[PDB]
Amino acid sequence: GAMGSCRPPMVKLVCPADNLRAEGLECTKTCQNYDLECMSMGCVSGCLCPPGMVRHENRCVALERCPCFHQGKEYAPGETVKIGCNTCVCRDRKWNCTDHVCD
């Protein structure tokens, strides 16, 4: 029934015979696989978030707003954490360490 059933869908993406739209290589695009490997399932009849948006916790958020991970825990942008004698803050889906003097 051409039912995505992929939770609240935003943008529908199908994979042509040779998968020209998904180029086969492409399948998913989320802050998790955006720069990392993609999941096998997703290229074929799937619903993801707009290009400038990423799929996170079934919700669409902007890349600059994407969640950050540090120690198995999920953090947010501008969120600071302490690592040893240095601290880091999530900026641009990446952590920025001050690396100040170890006290």
From Swiss-Prot:
Renumbered residue ranges of the record's region Amino-terminal: 5-26
Effect of residue 93 to Q: In VWD2; Normandy type
Domain of life: Eukaryota
Start and end residues of each stretch annotated as E1: 27-72
Paired cysteines (S-S): 6-47, 15-43, 49-60
Glycosylation sites: 96
Region CX, residue ranges: 65-92
Start and end residues of each TIL domain: 15-66
Protein name: von Willebrand factor
Organism: Homo sapiens
Residues included from the entire protein: 766 to 864 of 2813
